[model samples]
Structures are given as C-alpha cells and as structure tokens.
Target chain A: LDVDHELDAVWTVEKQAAATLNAWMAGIGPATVNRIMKAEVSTTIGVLSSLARAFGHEAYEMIIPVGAPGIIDYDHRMYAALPQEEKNKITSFINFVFEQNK
Target chain B: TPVGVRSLVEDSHLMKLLRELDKDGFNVDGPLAELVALVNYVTSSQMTMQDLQTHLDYCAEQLRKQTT
Candidate 1:
C-alpha cells in the first residue's frame, strides 16, 4: 500500500504498527476474514499480547479492549469498547491487510 | 488506500475476466474471486493490496491460458 500517503489517516507510527499487525493475519490462511476473526481466537490473543509488548498494553487494549486471555471478536464488546479513533485505525489496518494479502 | 472488490470491479479487464470466469452463467468463483467476494461479504475484511493485485494477476494468467 502507499504507506507514505496512507499513513496520513493512521494518526501515528505506533497506532499504525498495531494496525499493520492486525492486517497480516488475513494472509496466513485460506479461511474467510470473518471466519478467521471469529474462529482464530488464539491468533487474536497472540497478536494482541505481542502488540502489548511492542507498543504497550494500554495501546493494544485501546483497540482490542479485551484481557489477554479473553475472547476478542468483532462483536458488541469490540464495538462498544473501542473509541472512534481506535475503530477507524482498526478499519484502516484491516483494509491495508486485505488489500495487501488478497 | 487498500482496495476491495468494489474498487476492482471498476476495472474493465477484471470485469471481463469475471464474466468469462462466470461463463455458462455458473459464476465459478475461484480462490481469487472468492477473496474478492469476501471483501464484499464482510465490511471489516483483511488482505493486503498486494494480495488483491496478485490474485488479479493470477486471474489474468488463467485468462491467458484459455485464450492463448
């Protein structure tokens, strides 16, 4: 993707880092993005935990909003918990991932 | 910005390819097209722009085999 221009909407290099990590998940398997997001609970935890270290636990929590061992699906929990900016960043990153991997 | 099937369906070549791939009106969606459809099916989807481009390239390659 056009990282230079695209990164404009991302808000920060740090936020983009987590966004980029979330994007990479789609490329690893043949399953649909929906299925992966729902079924691959371990993958979500794994990445969130790693990002917690890479960026900061609060940073990751701002986006994911779940405890490390907790489930993080794209459901009401995620929708109600994440702030608008965090949600936007997640969409941006997911968009980036799909565009890059598909 | 990352592009999805909606952005891609605008391409005349891919549009043509989709029609051809859907020959006999069966609309046989392959992994590449299925990927595109997933973008349509799910709003919060994943995959890199390169991935979509590569899949399109693969479809173009398949088309080449048929016409050549």
Candidate 2:
C-alpha cells in the first residue's frame, strides 16, 4: 500500500514531465526536442532520477521501452514467468507509459 | 510440501535486504522491487535478456543523450 502510493505520486510527476516533453516535441522539429532537453536539466534529471530509483540499477534496461513499443509485444512466456506482484507493477507502469505518451 | 527458489524473492529475506538498502531514505522500495521482477523475467528467458536489453538500450540511450 505504501509503495503503491509513492509510485502513484511519482507517476503523477512523471506524467507531467512526459506531457511537457511531448508538448515540446509536438509540431516542433528535432531541435525543438533538443532544446527542451537542454533547457530543463533539473526537470529532466528529477524525472529521470525519480524513474531511476523506481527502476534501480536496471534503470538502464527498464528504461529501454520508454519511448518505444515497450513490453506490449514482449514474449508471453517472459511476462508470464514474473511473480504476480512484479507483473502488477510492470503492467501498471506499461499502461501508464503507453496511455500517457499516446 | 516445500517452497521453491522463486518464492524466496517474495520471502522475508529479500525484504530484509531491501530494508538494508533503504537505509539511505532513497525511497528504493518501488524501483528495487521492479528491478527484481525484471531480473527474474530476463533470467527466465534466454533471448529476452539480450533482445529486450538491446531494444531498451536504444530507447534509453536516445533519451539519455538528449536529456544530458
């Protein structure tokens, strides 16, 4: 319960960050994206670090699908092998990412 | 009736270790838990570790470059 609420708070922060980044990207060229990245160092790092802790050392790996198709088409066996608690966390994060980005 | 290795991840020991790691007040509970899940998922499948890591590497690296 406590963990979920903390995640909930972080997700809210992440959602806003995604929204800002996406808005900056929309109708803007690649440089616009670059500019946003360059402009908001703290916001970017705060969100990334927030995400990093949520993701841990595997932040490197877990971050992979953030801007892509993500775990949606993952091998079924891989996903199924996860414990129920993990699957739930993974599922919630994926859903949040896809829905927020789309 | 016996338990398996997989069950131990959810066992008290993992939580104990997690408690140790949390001494910094880093609020590691969520990320560490998620990483454990990913670790188990990757180890369970042969191709997935490389396949997903390669894919995510690309995803994250692109962002890492721009964000930094």
Candidate 3:
C-alpha cells in the first residue's frame, strides 16, 4: 500500500470523526485544531492517547491497518464458524468470565 | 516553560510503551509501521498540545464511525 496515501486517509477519517463528535468543544483552541487538521502541524502520542481515552478507545486503534480485522472481528468470525453446541459453550464461558469479573 | 518538561516526560513514557508494544509484535517494520512513522513525525516536528488534541479528536471521530 502507498503509506502516504494511507496516512492521508487516516487523517481524513480523524478529521471527519472529530467534527462529528464535537471533540474540539472540550477546552481546545479552534485555530490549533484547524491547523492540525489542515496538516499545518503535527500531533504527539500523549494528545492522541488522551483523545482516544475520551472516546473510549485505545491509541493502537488509530494506527491499525485500514480494514484490518481486530480482536472483535476475530471473535465474530470464530463464533460464526462454530457449531451451535460450541457456540453455546463459548457464550456460557464468556458469561461466566463476566460474572466472575463482576 | 513547564510545557517542555512535561513533553519530555510524555515522550519518555510513550517511548517505554512503544518498547513494550514492540516486544508484543508491534514493531516499526511490522503491524505498527504507521504508528512508528507518526511518532517520528511528532517528535521531530513542531507542534503543540492543542494541535495534538485536535488530531486526536479527529481520530476518535473516525473510529466511532468505523466501529458503529
């Protein structure tokens, strides 16, 4: 893949998400945010992590290859491929884990 | 003033985290190649916390759409 193009797509999605979520309303300056969106400035890990946390996500989620299947996808695929009996077992085990954690 | 000191700590902490991630198979030459590039750009370039925050907001927004 063209890394630069991929990066640009990543930034585009980020800008779209920021706008839709009203993320800049939280004590951040509009001019700086605008400049960063326009690619006039760079971003740091701390800033990225903080925002991800605010959005209830992990920072790694931002940089993963676009369209790559994550753990969620893996679970969904595995569950779909399992027999009904196995699925029931998996579901039961998951519920047990959740109950234990709670 | 204090921003510089704080940034230093943040950078150090980020580096340590990156090292751990690398050990877990997320390396510059691997699945985390884009992240490595981003970190390099951020550290070597001029930017402020405000800029970073803005970028982060944008990322969060995109993630919301992707997952939902």
Candidate 4:
C-alpha cells in the first residue's frame, strides 16, 4: 500500500496500450505493433528532453515502462502536441496493417 | 532464506526463482516489496524475459537497498 496512488496511474497505461494494439491491428502487421511501441517511447523521450522548464531538476524519477500501448490519455495528449509528421507516422504505420493484404 | 542463496538465484529464470521462493513460503518485505509484486504481475501478464529483466533491474535500482 505504500506505493499505491492515483487510480489512473495503476492501470491506465495497460488499457491504453491494449487499445493502441487493436487500432494498429486494424491497419498493420506484427511489425507495426513493434513500431508503435517504439514510437511511443521515442515520443516520450523527445518530449521529456525538451521539457527544460518543467521537471528541470526532476525531484522524482519518471520511469515509463515500455509497453505496447500507453496511457491512452497521456499518449493522445502528447501526440496532439507533436509536429504533423510525427502524428502522421503513427497513423500511417497503423494503416500498414493491411499492406500485405491481397 | 537469507540473501545470495544460489538455489534461489544464480542463473535461474528470475520468475521461476521468485516462484520458488514464494512456494517455499518466502516473501519480499519492507520498502520495496510493492515493487516485487508489481514485477510479478506485469511480467506474468505479457512481458518477455528480457523485458522482465530490464524491468526487474529498474525496480531493483528504485528499491535502493531497502531490503537488508
């Protein structure tokens, strides 16, 4: 119980990751799934790298687990903040799930 | 029992080792115990061995020698 806090923090990432997996399946293959996983991590890294004003000293270490999907809300919010190409890459690769389809 | 037991660790599959300890009525206690529970849950759910190891290493670092 010592570590427990904020209900959303406990399980939201898993739920969002599941949704991202399903959405990717609607468009791409297993490989695309892998891409989304990496993109999500990369995007987070990019954002954190640029957050010079916020969390500058970083009193608490932020450890984001690498999972298929992520906090849907957190990811979506972050995705919205990204440049167009970053957003396009996410959905475009997701669309590739059908690439091998005859 | 105690730390550094070869049978409990030492090249065994980490999850299996954790299970053996749990089966032998062993349990993690103190500040980092929640983390052990978290790893067991996540790794058992969908993570691969490498992912679990990376995760365990992360958790161990976060634990900061709380269990001694």
Judge the docking of candidate 4 as incorrect, acceptable, medium or high.
incorrect
Using TM-score, rank the candidates from best to worst: 3, 4, 2, 1
Clashing pairs in 2: A54-B31, A64-B56
> Mind giving the per-residue lDDT tens digits that candidate 1 earns over B1-68?
44443354333365456666776676456634664554443333333554676667656755798999
Interface RMSD of each: 12.8, 10.4, 13.2, 11.6
Measured by TM-score, the strongest candidate is 3
Worst 10 residues of 1 chain B by lDDT: B38-47
Report DockQ per prediction, comma-separated.
Answer: 0.02, 0.02, 0.01, 0.02
| Per-residue lDDT over B6-62 for candidate 4, one digit per residue giving the tens place of the 0 to 100 score | 232223365444455765655644323645555444433433554566556655644
Q: Following a full C-alpha superposition, what root-mean-square deviation does model 3 have from the true structure?
A: 22.2
lDDT of 2 at B10: 40
Task: Identify the CAPRI category of the predicted complex in candidate 3.
Answer: incorrect
Candidate 3 local lDDT, residue A12: 59
lDDT tens per residue, model 3, B19-64: 6777776444553455556554554453455456655665575579
Name the lDDT of candidate 4.
0.42
Candidate 3, A1-102: lDDT as tens digits:
312232223545555444433533332556755665445444566665665555555554544333444333332324556799887756655464455446
Better of 2 and 3 by TM-score: 3
Score chain A of each prediction against the true chain A by TM-score and list the results.
0.26, 0.27, 0.35, 0.26
Model 3 error, position B58 (Å)? 38
DockQ of 3: 0.01
